[PDB]
Design a binder for this molecule. Structure first.
Ligand code: K5C
Ligand code: MG
Lengths: 412, 556
């Protein structure tokens, strides 16, 4: 691939100028070794002071791998890089991927380093390996080839990839293959033994066209909007009925026809919260009619590819996290719940970071893009710690929730 | 002639769309012109500048100034205009090392590189932009026109390009001599090591040998400064460091300017002098932009100052960093949102100190502030030492566990141990998860007229207890909290409270222990006195008994 693809920023936009955040010594050392080798292989070059741009860099360890890996935070460069239609008017996202019984995630970002990056654009990929305590200037580099995590890399490489895959796709018409950034998502409806065979029979095919040996296995079988459920009880206290009317009043914003009049009627007076209240027939029927309403899907829910996906997360305690993905309030496109996050029964922030990564993966599989997160955490705590538990090659956007939402209860 | 290597040129451009400068040269006196001609003839002989013709259309004004004992005219080329038009550079100097991160060095040499500076050539395609003109005597001949061949002093790119050029020249020497450290500041170059003065002097000669490959001569700095090095506001001693003398002035009149400088010194001093505090002195500046406004000191600002003078009465010093020892960070609560800390490796030998002040906000609590202080110190320690310290915190292990298991946000603090140093951070109240059997149930409500500001707050209970209080100059939100306050005041040690106020729930669920609202503070004081409080929420105007009753009582 001698010919470079002309790339430009968007009109009236300079390159990124993002501060490098401080790194521990062990991550600095890991990055020095990695970048020394990349430089010997020609993937990056030392740059001079006439280049004022910068994108942050850090070091991670992929899911269950002891080898340090370099991760560049290209979020700013990606939003400044021209919108891309490298080959066609767009890649219609495969609605069939989310329906497949199993989906395996392959890191193919190494393939990018075989394509040269347009020489006029290289300066915008500048990054700095920082020094400890400013005791030496940072090491300054730019990319000479398509970098991992950049928007343009899958776009510029798409002509090459579609050809590397066509033989495999030609024989397996029922296997769905989707690429998002540095990742290939390979899905099928067959028992894993053949699946891991096909998967291993895909990377080998890839190895003969020029890898990693890592995979991530999913089952979009169980992905929908979780029903709102109401308690089933033989004796209701005042407190129980108050919590029920509250939940039903919240649900009435999502569902038409929810009624609470007959249930509210039970609370006629000024009763002790622990007092048992017998349900009337009218109240039981109303509750029954509410249960029915809540069995059907929400009215007029549709994905609009022009709008952002928004992901909200609630800490429920004891290792449990609930989340909703939507574009418009009360029109959830997906809800879910996580329990017992792996490797952090005593660390909230690690659990939140893994939940953010799982929700992002689900979002890529369903819609082919990442949501904007609303995180139940103070900014300074999140920004101090999340890079410590990040294991993905992409990074989504996020904002912080500082006021406790009343609705955490309703997803309980 | 011994061939020398050229210093690699940095290519430079003007900002997109901009041309070079075209500033008119001012008239100069005959005396100044004479001086400038002499100065420039000498710079021209040294290769720093070259004569050019009148084809070049750019120009930057030049001036002649002097010192008062110094018996000469000085030359000044004002590159303000050219700097506005020059591309930005990677400014590789902004941050400096913190002394507490430095490691002890037995021997340190200084080398003057002021002359190596002029060996750094300016990009040839950029020189034209540096043209200037010496006006002629009596303006009767063409002005003498020159341009720079070297990095001009005063030009936007000279510091970054000079430092980058030296770094690249020095890199092979530093890489192959890992038993020395090399650091550059202005025209000075500092070389430290733990070698005997003999091998150390030998590395210096080797470094001199190395720099000669680029024709760079480097003698020792004039009037070798005995320790400590005065540098960036510090005193770098061979085995200790501190800030330069902190002297608080004595005054009976303090203006808005005085109090700003006092905080500056105090903030600077707080990196080694433990327990410095600057709230009460900062509070006297909340919002002003005029600087002689004599602001009297509160009895609390005076106390704070006097407390600082005591801390500053004697000099204190930090130690340098020992990589083979643990790194320990200890925090104390000081009051009024203020926090202090010490970072050390051996007890009583601080590497450095610091402070943290609560963020601006309507409500807050001590555990959130402590958490924030921990993240600040974590980030500072990664900068300075490349690692997180072990924390010693004035909060019990059980208190922290209760906090983070129950708090609605995710939160984390890294490896830490309890240090029993009062005052201790604690949870002041904890709400119940379930309604309390046998406890009276208060249904509270409040309401206010938007126009008249008249309102009512009150409660009704399952025992028939009732209260409605009329209020003036109030709001819906304030009557809603006032109703909760009355229920707390009038109930026993255990109480169930039912509100429809999402506003009040949002406040209390945030678990504040102090507020800028006196009413919230009064509610906090009540909660602290209770044994058990269950707070339940219901939606307004849905016929919820008790809520319906009190709602009508307070709504006119
Ligand atoms: C080497 C150096 C010098 C300075 C001075 C500026 C001024 N004006 C600044 C920095 C950042 C330097 O850079 C590094 N300095 C250190 N450590 C220091 C070395 C100096 N001592 C003080 C001292 C020691 C011995 C003598 S003595 N016995 O020769 O009289 C005199 C003074 C404190 C620790 N470590 C590193 C690591 C990477 S860079 C760097
Ligand atoms: Mg009301």
């Amino acid at each position: 691939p001698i010919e470079t693809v002309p790339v430009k920023l968007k009109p009236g936009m300079d390159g990124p100028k993002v501060k490098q955040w401080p790194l521990t010594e062990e991550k600095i050392k890991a990055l020095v070794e990695i970048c020394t080798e990349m430089e010997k292989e020609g993937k990056i070059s030392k740059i001079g002071p006439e280049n004022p741009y910068n994108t942050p860099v850090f070091a991670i360890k992929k899911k269950d791998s002891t080898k340090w890996r370099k991760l560049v935070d290209f979020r700013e460069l990606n939003k400044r890089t021209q919108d891309f239609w490298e080959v066609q008017l767009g890649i219609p996202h495969p609605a069939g991927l989310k329906k497949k019984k199993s989906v395996t995630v392959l890191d193919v970002g190494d393939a990018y380093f075989s394509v040269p990056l347009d020489e006029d654009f290289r300066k915008y990929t500048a990054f700095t390996i920082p020094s400890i305590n400013n005791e030496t200037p940072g090491i300054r580099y730019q990319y000479n080839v398509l970098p991992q995590g950049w928007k343009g890399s899958p776009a510029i490489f798409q002509s090459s990839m579609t050809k590397i895959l066509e033989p495999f796709k030609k024989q397996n018409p029922d296997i769905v293959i989707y690429q998002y950034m540095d990742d290939l998502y390979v899905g099928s409806d067959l028992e894993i033994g053949q699946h891991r065979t096909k998967i291993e029979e895909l990377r080998q095919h890839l190895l003969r066209w020029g890898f990693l040996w890592m995979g991530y296995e999913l089952h979009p079988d169980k992905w929908t909007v979780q029903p709102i459920v109401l308690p089933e009880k033989d004796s209701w206290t005042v407190n129980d009925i108050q919590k029920l009317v509250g939940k039903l009043n919240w649900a009435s914003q999502i569902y038409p026809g929810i009624k609470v009049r007959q249930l509210s009627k039970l609370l006629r007076g000024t009763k002790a919260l622990t007092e048992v209240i017998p349900l009337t027939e009218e109240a039981e029927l109303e509750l029954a009619e509410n249960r029915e309403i809540l069995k059907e899907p929400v009215h007029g829910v549709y994905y609009d590819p022009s709008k952002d996906l928004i992901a909200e997360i609630q800490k429920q305690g004891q290792g449990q996290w609930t989340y909703q993905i939507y574009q418009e309030p009360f029109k959830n496109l997906k809800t879910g719940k996580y329990a017992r996050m792996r490797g952090a029964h005593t660390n909230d922030v690690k659990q939140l970071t893994e939940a953010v990564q799982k929700i992002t993966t689900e979002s890529i599989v369903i819609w082919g893009k990442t949501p904007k997160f609303k995180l139940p955490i103070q900014k300074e705590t999140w920004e101090t710690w999340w890079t410590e538990y990040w294991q993905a090659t992409w990074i989504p956007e996020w904002e912080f929730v500082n006021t406790p939402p009343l609705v955490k209860l309703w997803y309980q | 002639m011994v061939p020398i290597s050229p210093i690699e040129t940095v290519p430079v451009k003007l900002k997109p769309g901009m041309d070079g400068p075209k500033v008119k040269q001012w008239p100069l006196t005959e005396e100044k012109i004479k001086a400038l001609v002499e100065i420039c003839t000498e710079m021209e002989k040294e290769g720093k500048i070259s004569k050019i013709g009148p084809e070049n259309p750019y120009n930057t004004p030049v001036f002649a100034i002097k010192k008062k004992d110094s018996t000469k005219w000085r030359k000044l080329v004002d590159f303000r205009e050219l700097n506005k038009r020059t591309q930005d550079f990677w400014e590789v100097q902004l941050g400096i090392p913190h002394p507490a991160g430095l490691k002890k060095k037995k021997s340190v040499t200084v080398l003057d590189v002021g002359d190596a500076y002029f060996s750094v050539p300016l990009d040839e395609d950029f020189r034209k932009y540096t043209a200037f003109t010496i006006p002629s005597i009596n303006n009767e001949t063409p002005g003498i026109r020159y341009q720079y061949n070297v990095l001009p002093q005063g030009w936007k790119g000279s510091p970054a390009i000079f430092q980058s050029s030296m770094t690249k020249i020095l890199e092979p020497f530093a890489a192959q001599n890992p038993d020395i450290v090399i650091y550059q500041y202005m025209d000075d170059l500092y070389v430290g090591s733990d070698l005997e003065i003999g091998q150390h002097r030998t590395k210096i000669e080797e470094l001199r040998q190395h720099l000669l490959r680029w024709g760079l001569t480097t003698p020792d700095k004039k009037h070798q400064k005995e320790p400590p090095f005065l540098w960036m506001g510090y005193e770098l001693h061979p085995d200790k460091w501190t800030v330069q003398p902190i002297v608080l002035p004595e005054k009976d009149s303090w203006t808005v300017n005085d109090i700003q400088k006092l905080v500056g010194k105090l903030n600077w001093a707080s990196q080694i002098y433990p327990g410095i505090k600057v709230r009460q002195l900062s509070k006297l500046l909340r919002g002003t932009k005029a600087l002689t406004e004599v602001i009297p000191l509160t009895e609390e600002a005076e106390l704070e100052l006097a407390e600082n003078r005591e801390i500053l009465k004697e000099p204190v010093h930090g130690v340098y960093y020992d990589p083979s020892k643990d790194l320990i960070a200890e925090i104390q609560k000081q009051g009024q949102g203020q926090w202090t800390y010490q970072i050390y490796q051996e007890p009583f030998k601080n590497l450095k100190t610091g402070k943290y002040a609560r963020m601006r906000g309507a409500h807050t609590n001590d555990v959130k502030q402590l958490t924030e202080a921990v993240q600040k110190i974590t980030t500072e320690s990664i900068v300075i030492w490349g690692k997180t310290p072990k924390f010693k915190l004035p909060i019990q292990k059980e208190t922290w566990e209760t906090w983070w298991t129950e708090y609605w946000q995710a939160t984390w603090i890294p490896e830490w141990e309890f240090v029993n140093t009062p005052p201790l951070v604690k949870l002041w109240y904890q709400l119940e998860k379930e309604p309390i059997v046998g406890a009276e149930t208060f249904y509270v409500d409040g309401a206010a007229n938007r126009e008249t500001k008249l309102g009512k707050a009150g409660y009704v209970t399952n025992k028939g207890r009732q209260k409605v209080v009329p209020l003036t100059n109030t709001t819906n939100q304030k009557t809603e909290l006032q109703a909760i306050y009355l229920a707390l005041q009038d109930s026993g040690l255990e109480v169930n409270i039912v509100t429809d106020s999402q506003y009040a729930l949002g406040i209390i669920q945030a678990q504040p222990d102090k507020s800028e609202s006196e009413l919230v503070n009064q509610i906090i004081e009540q909660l602290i006195k209770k044994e058990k409080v269950y707070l339940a929420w219901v939606p307004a105007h849905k016929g919820i008994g008790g809520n319906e009753q009190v709602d009508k009582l307070v709504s006119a």
